[PDB]
Design a protein around this ligand. Structure first.
Ligand SMILES: *[C@@H]1O[C@H](CO)[C@@H](O[C@@H]2O[C@H](CO)[C@@H](O[C@@H]3O[C@H](CO)[C@@H](O)[C@H](O)[C@H]3NC(C)=O)[C@H](O)[C@H]2NC(C)=O)[C@H](O)[C@H]1NC(C)=O
Ligand SMILES: *[C@@H]1O[C@H](CO)[C@@H](O[C@@H]2O[C@H](CO)[C@@H](O[C@@H]3O[C@H](CO)[C@@H](O)[C@H](O)[C@@H]3O)[C@H](O)[C@H]2NC(C)=O)[C@H](O)[C@H]1NC(C)=O
Ligand SMILES: *[C@@H]1O[C@H](CO)[C@@H](O[C@@H]2O[C@H](CO)[C@@H](O[C@@H]3O[C@H](CO)[C@@H](O)[C@H](O)[C@@H]3O)[C@H](O)[C@H]2NC(C)=O)[C@H](O)[C@H]1NC(C)=O
Ligand SMILES: *[C@@H]1O[C@H](CO)[C@@H](O[C@@H]2O[C@H](CO)[C@@H](O)[C@H](O)[C@H]2NC(C)=O)[C@H](O)[C@H]1NC(C)=O
Ligand SMILES: *[C@@H]1O[C@H](CO)[C@@H](O[C@@H]2O[C@H](CO)[C@@H](O)[C@H](O)[C@H]2NC(C)=O)[C@H](O)[C@H]1NC(C)=O
Ligand SMILES: *[C@@H]1O[C@H](CO)[C@@H](O[C@@H]2O[C@H](CO)[C@@H](O)[C@H](O)[C@H]2NC(C)=O)[C@H](O)[C@H]1NC(C)=O
Ligand SMILES: *[C@@H]1O[C@H](CO)[C@@H](O[C@@H]2O[C@H](CO)[C@@H](O)[C@H](O)[C@H]2NC(C)=O)[C@H](O)[C@H]1NC(C)=O
Ligand SMILES: *[C@@H]1O[C@H](CO)[C@@H](O)[C@H](O)[C@H]1NC(C)=O
Ligand SMILES: *[C@@H]1O[C@H](CO)[C@@H](O)[C@H](O)[C@H]1NC(C)=O
Ligand SMILES: *[C@@H]1O[C@H](CO)[C@@H](O)[C@H](O)[C@H]1NC(C)=O
Ligand SMILES: *[C@@H]1O[C@H](CO)[C@@H](O)[C@H](O)[C@H]1NC(C)=O
Ligand SMILES: *[C@@H]1O[C@H](CO)[C@@H](O)[C@H](O)[C@H]1NC(C)=O
Ligand SMILES: *[C@@H]1O[C@H](CO)[C@@H](O)[C@H](O)[C@H]1NC(C)=O
Ligand SMILES: *[C@@H]1O[C@H](CO)[C@@H](O)[C@H](O)[C@H]1NC(C)=O
Ligand SMILES: [Ca+2]
Lengths: 48, 921, 48
């Protein structure tokens, strides 16, 4: 929540939906990386 | 000129036949008071044909029942149960028309079946007998239409529709004015940090869609609020919201950054300042504020407690986007302040949400159902069904279902729809005679805003854009690229030349009651080349009925009188028809006939040969004043052939003679060189015929260069003289006789007069007629600033010959960078100022000196220059360029400041003690 | 649209969110393919 701070703005119409723009949204998103599912979409959106 | 033409012989012709005439007056004031009585009667009948569509439209609503299931509706669905009826070809509509079944247009956004849509097709079938009656009550009616609040639209003639069609009738110019009042609106865009990303692109879009629901009585201004509140507009107050001023704000909206802290307290305190003032103008009507934030944790009670004591400013708030913030306080803001909160999820929902904003403001109209039914005419626009310039008349339809019995009265509010009956301007222009009155004369009409109904340069192809930038890297090989539902609102001060005299005319005409004024002006010639200066006598009256127009008749001062056709011998006119046949081309000449009107005709698409042969057939049946005039015109130009041109036969010289008369007969005599007469056979839209009537001397026109085709040495240049006739102490100017000078022959006089140095025969207009020196002999007819600008920039600066720079709003250009689009252009037009035909000067450009001497010839249109040199050091500074350069419009930030006098309307419904605002929500 | 009756006809799909680049589709219920209705259908989705 500090490194990414809800910086997921982008100005597009695609739902980059695993944002960190809350606390419990960040909790669920973080868990996704541990299970190793789909952590491209998480990461690709971090560097973008 | 006096010899090659038989002008003095043609004086001898009109003076010979003292019979076959009776010179009649125009009176002017009488023609306009008569024409004002007709345009009233035009609107009278169509006015009422709304009133039959309003009364019988309300009655069927009161007995509808509301059927839920549907197993029985048989309509047309005009975009393809369904019917497929017959079609007759017609010319009033230039399409296929039905006359027996109503059509239905449904937007391709909303249909299934639907219990909302389909239930409204049930009761709106009842209108069609009332549709069918007015056709047989009165022929020549254009598109009747019932629009509706749910997007339906029925219209009686039924034509099929005109690749992706958007067209939502709930946002169309004519539907909005008839469902609201004027609006002092104010759009506030929240621009903090919370709106970057998805919610930015929506507001950039949603503001740009909100401004299209404005008419031209509405006022706006765009104020982001932030830390501080500013106007990102370059306006600081309310605009008039033209076509133009709406374009300014969209370039302002599309460059908004997003960062900072929301406050709402400096913002609204900035907003309630703007709707005050009462200094500029404003419509003083339903005041809207609109708030485009994304949620925010503030019920800003303070500012509403300080400024909405009286509750006379309603607030629409919208929230866009898919933020997870609070939509709490914002629903509290609207519902208290008579607002109606709406919510824009994403793109696609934008069109549906920004149009229901007008239904909320209809609440004072629905509470005043006695007086609110007045016919509100929309100004002018191009119809979507391709008919031309149309003007609509509208009248709203209420949902009276609970009256004098009352009942629960739940939706005794919001209206049903707007009935519309359109009117072509051609319908008007057949009421306006423009065939007895001297081609620089014309009827003309102004709305209360200062916009135009009948100036003869309206010309379809809408107006008014900056430099029309298109990139081709952004588009796809695909979708239709929308067609601009924008009206055509032309300013009177931009339909002509601006003058201190005309503004006095415009400000009096926009409200006043009678008057006329005669003066001296600059006149822009047709297909702009040339400004003449002459006299005008023009009047004005308002329409005795409505105030939504006022006429005016411009006249040349030599045009009080006209020729009455009167032939009572019937053999003489038949001999005149015998001239008019194509059998006599070696005898008379190629005789050409302008497209005009009678009973069963057509228009020649350059097959004037066919139209003439069609016209020949007409009188052969007959064997009413235009038909007699052309016959009376026919022999009076024939006698110039047989009594003056027959006795000459192809001189040393001429190349080709021609005679243009009003009445539409133009003859070129050799007929081998006549077939090349490359101009407009319409005498009233002809360019040189009008220009010839202004001056009292010889007129020279320089043709173009490359132009499409053989206008050249092949052609030569054009001479002209208006023919003045002295009937018994009167002055009539019927005809114009032209000589087309063979160029190399006129080189041969110009050469041998030189031998018995750099000289230019030059016109008014800076266009090269001829020269020495043989580099210029191919440029003939190019503006001389493109040849020798160092002279010409000097020559104007040591005066005569000056310039005005108008702007044209309908010309079409090529787009730049970042097929055919309309764009605002400039036009330099050069003219003479000062007399004393002896202008010598000594030019030093820089480091080299040379000599000028400019001599204006007498009793003609000619500059003769003697310059001596080229061979010294050159001076390529710039190029004074005529033609049209694509450019911008005027400065909108300063045009708004000293704005433009006008008047608003007179209803402004607002604030009933009834209403009751609990819906919202 | 959210509801059975109110979701048919056509609508506007925007390729990237320029509101000019506007394309059509028919609209219909996409029953989302790993649905929880029957307990047979549920275990095939808790498996994923
Ligand atoms: C430029 O070219 C012109 C040809 O287009 C020449 O114009 C001709 O000039 C003649 C004398 O200058 C004129 O002759 C006179 O014609 C009238 C009737 O047209 C007669 O009554 C006169 O008697 C006769 N003059 C004499 C002395 O007999 C021609 O009318 C006239 N036009 C033509 C032939 O079309 C110009 O002369 C010429 N300029 C120069 C400087 O050479
Ligand atoms: C809206 O649609 C409904 C049908 O869905 C139309 O209602 C129909 O109205 C006609 C006359 O208005 C009814 O005809 C009558 O039927 C009786 C038989 O019960 C007969 O004895 C009468 O002489 C007459 O023929 C018809 O029954 C009725 N249809 C239904 C299904 O009830 C209605 O007319 C439509 N609205 C408009 C404005 O047209
Ligand atoms: C013109 O005004 C009248 C005002 O009463 C409107 O009539 C009312 O329309 C509503 C629409 O929702 C009807 O409600 C419906 O009732 C049925 C009954 O079972 C219900 O099942 C539906 O879910 C729906 O809510 C209401 O009954 C009706 N009033 C009466 C007395 O019939 C009328 O619709 C207005 N016209 C238009 C075009 O809006
Ligand atoms: C327009 O509104 C302004 C308010 O912003 C008025 O400005 C005041 O004018 C009076 C004199 O008429 C000055 O004494 C005040 O100092 C002005 N206000 C401020 C804040 O400086 C103005 O009068 C109004 N009318 C016109 C014609 O400008
Ligand atoms: C509408 O037009 C009629 C007809 O022109 C006006 O009648 C004029 O009345 C004045 C007296 O006020 C007479 O001197 C005029 O001669 C009348 N006109 C004509 C043509 O004779 C009527 O006044 C106009 N309506 C209004 C409200 O001005
Ligand atoms: C306009 O219509 C007339 C028809 O009356 C055309 O004249 C004919 O032209 C053709 C060749 O194009 C000849 O074979 C005919 O003999 C001409 N006369 C008639 C009576 O048919 C004229 O060419 C048309 N002009 C254009 C531009 O289409
Ligand atoms: C358009 O041309 C006219 C030519 O007459 C200009 O009007 C003259 O302007 C001068 C000074 O600019 C004045 O001294 C004269 O009194 C004006 N004469 C008339 C008859 O009005 C006019 O200024 C030009 N306008 C533009 C924008 O160039
Ligand atoms: C208007 O309608 C009436 C009656 O239908 C008719 O007499 C009159 O000629 C119409 N007006 C015009 C300008 O034709
Ligand atoms: C924003 O863009 C508009 C249009 O190009 C321009 O007028 C304005 O100066 C721009 N502002 C900034 C800060 O770039
Ligand atoms: C216009 O008319 C007045 C008076 O009749 C006259 O003095 C003036 O010369 C006329 N204008 C022109 C351009 O000749
Ligand atoms: C048209 O005239 C221009 C002079 O400005 C010249 O440059 C051009 O070549 C001409 N057109 C053609 C097709 O030669
Ligand atoms: C041309 O006119 C302008 C108008 O102000 C003047 O400043 C200038 O001196 C003139 N040019 C010359 C060469 O005198
Ligand atoms: C004509 O122009 C000259 C200079 O070109 C000027 O001095 C003179 O006053 C002008 N005459 C009139 C009547 O304007
Ligand atoms: C300017 O004058 C000088 C002489 O003083 C000469 O040498 C030079 O070539 C001239 N240049 C131009 C551009 O006329
Ligand atoms: Ca915020």
């Amino acid at each position: 929540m500090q490194l990414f701070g809800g910086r997921y703005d982008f100005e597009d119409t695609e739902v980059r939906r695993s944002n960190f723009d809350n606390f419990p949204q960040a909790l669920i998103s973080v868990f996704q990386v541990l299970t190793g599912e789909d952590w491209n979409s998480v990461m690709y959106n971090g560097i973008m | 000129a006096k010899t090659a033409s038989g002008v003095h012989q043609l004086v001898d012709i009109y003076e010979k036949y003292q019979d076959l005439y009776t010179v009649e007056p125009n009176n002017a004031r009488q023609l306009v008071e008569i024409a004002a009585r007709d345009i009233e009667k035009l609107l009278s009948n169509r006015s009422k044909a709304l009133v039959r569509l309003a009364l019988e439209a309300e009655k069927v609503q009161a007995a509808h029942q509301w059927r839920e299931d549907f197993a029985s509706v048989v309509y047309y669905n005009a975009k393809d149960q369904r019917i497929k009826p017959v079609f007759i070809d017609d010319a009033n509509f230039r399409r296929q028309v039905s006359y027996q079944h109503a059509a239905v247009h449904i937007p391709t956004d909303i249909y299934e079946g639907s219990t909302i849509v389909l239930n409204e097709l049930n009761w709106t079938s009842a209108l069609d007998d009332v549709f069918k009656k007015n056709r047989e009550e009165d022929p020549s009616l254009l598109w009747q239409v019932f629009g509706s609040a749910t997007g339906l639209a029925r219209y009686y003639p039924a034509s099929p529709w005109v690749k992706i069609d958007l067209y939502d009738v709930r946002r169309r110019p004519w539907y909005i004015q008839g469902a609201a009042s004027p609006k002092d609106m104010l759009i506030l865009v929240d621009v903090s940090g919370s709106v970057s990303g998805l919610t930015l692109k929506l507001i950039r879009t949603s503001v740009s869609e909100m401004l299209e629901t404005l008419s031209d009585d509405d006022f706006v201004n765009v104020a982001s609020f932030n830390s501080n509140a500013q106007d990102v507009s370059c306006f600081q107050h309310l605009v008039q919201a033209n076509v133009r001023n709406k374009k300014v704000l969209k370039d302002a909206v599309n460059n908004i950054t997003a960062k900072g802290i929301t406050d709402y307290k400096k913002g609204f305190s900035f907003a309630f300042e703007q709707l005050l003032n009462y200094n500029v103008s404003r419509a003083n009507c339903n005041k809207i504020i609109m708030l485009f934030t994304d949620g925010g944790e503030e019920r800003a009670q303070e500012i509403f407690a300080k400024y909405n004591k009286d509750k006379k400013v309603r607030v629409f708030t919208f929230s866009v986007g898919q933020h997870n913030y609070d939509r709490g306080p914002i629903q509290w803001m609207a519902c208290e302040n008579k607002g109606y909160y709406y919510e824009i999820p994403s793109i696609g929902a934008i069109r549906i949400n920004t149009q229901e904003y007008l239904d909320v403001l209809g609440r004072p109209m629905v509470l005043a159902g006695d007086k609110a039914k007045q016919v509100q005419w929309t100004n002018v626009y191009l119809d979507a069904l391709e008919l031309g310039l149309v003007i609509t008349g509208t009248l709203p339809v209420f949902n009276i279902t609970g009256q004098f019995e009352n009942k629960t009265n739940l939706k005794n509010q919001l209206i049903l729809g707007v009935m519309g009956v359109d009117v072509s301007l051609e319908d008007i222009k057949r009421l306006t005679p423009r065939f007895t009155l001297c081609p620089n004369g014309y009827y003309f009409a102004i709305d209360p805003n200062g916009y135009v109904l009948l100036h003869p340069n309206l010309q379809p192809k809408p107006i008014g854009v900056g430099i029309p930038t298109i990139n081709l890297r952004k588009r796809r090989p695909n979708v239709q690229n929308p067609k601009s539902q924008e009206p055509v609102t032309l300013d009177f001060l931009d339909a002509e030349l601006e003058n201190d005299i005309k503004v006095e005319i415009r400000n009096k005409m926009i409200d006043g009651e009678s008057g006329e004024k005669t003066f001296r002006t600059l006149v822009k010639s047709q297909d702009e080349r040339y400004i003449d200066k002459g006299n005008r006598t023009y009047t004005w009256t308002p329409v005795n009925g409505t105030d939504y127009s006022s006429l005016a008749l411009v006249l040349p001062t030599y045009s009080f009188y006209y020729i009455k056709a009167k032939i009572e011998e019937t053999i003489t006119q038949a001999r005149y028809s015998e001239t008019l046949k194509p059998d006599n081309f070696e005898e008379s000449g190629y005789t050409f006939l302008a497209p005009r009107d009678y009973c069963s005709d057509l228009k020649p698409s350059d097959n004037n040969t066919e139209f003439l042969l069609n016209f020949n057939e007409f009188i052969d049946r007959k064997t009413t004043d235009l038909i007699n005039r052309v016959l009376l015109d026919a022999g009076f130009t024939n006698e110039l052939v047989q009594n003056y041109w027959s006795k000459q036969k192809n001189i040393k010289g001429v190349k080709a003679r021609f005679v243009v008369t009003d009445g539409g007969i133009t003859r070129v005599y050799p007929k081998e060189a006549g077939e090349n007469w490359q101009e407009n056979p319409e005498t009233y839209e002809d360019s040189f015929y009008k220009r010839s009537l202004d001056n009292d001397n010889y007129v020279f026109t320089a043709p173009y260069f490359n132009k499409s085709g053989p206008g050249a040495y092949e052609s030569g240049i054009m001479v002209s003289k208006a023919v003045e006739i002295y009937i018994q102490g009167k002055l009539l100017k019927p005809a114009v006789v032209g000589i087309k000078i063979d160029v190399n022959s006129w080189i041969e006089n110009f050469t041998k007069t030189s031998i018995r140095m750099d000289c230019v025969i030059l016109d008014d207009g800076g266009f090269l007629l001829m020269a020495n020196h043989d580099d210029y002999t191919n440029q003939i007819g190019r503006f001389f600033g493109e040849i020798d600008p160092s002279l010409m920039r000097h020559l104007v600066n040591i005066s005569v010959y000056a310039f005005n720079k108008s702007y044209d709003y309908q010309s079409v250009c090529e787009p730049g960078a970042a097929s055919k689009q309309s764009c605002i252009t400039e036009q330099t037009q050069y003219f003479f100022d000062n007399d004393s035909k002896s202008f010598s000067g000594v030019l030093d450009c820089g480091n080299c000196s040379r000599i000028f001497h400019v001599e204006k010839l007498m009793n003609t249109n000619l500059i003769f220059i003697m310059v001596e040199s080229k061979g010294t050091c050159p001076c390529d500074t710039r190029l004074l360029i005529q033609a049209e350069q694509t450019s911008d419009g005027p400065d909108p930030c300063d045009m708004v400041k000293q704005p433009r006098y006008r008047k608003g309307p007179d209803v402004c419904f607002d604030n009933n003690v009834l209403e009751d605002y609990t819906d919202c929500x | 649209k959210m509801t059975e009756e109110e979701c048919r006809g056509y609508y506007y799909v925007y390729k990237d969110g320029d509101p000019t680049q506007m394309e059509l589709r028919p609209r219909q219920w996409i029953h989302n393919d790993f649905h929880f209705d029957n307990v047979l259908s549920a275990m095939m989705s808790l498996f994923t």
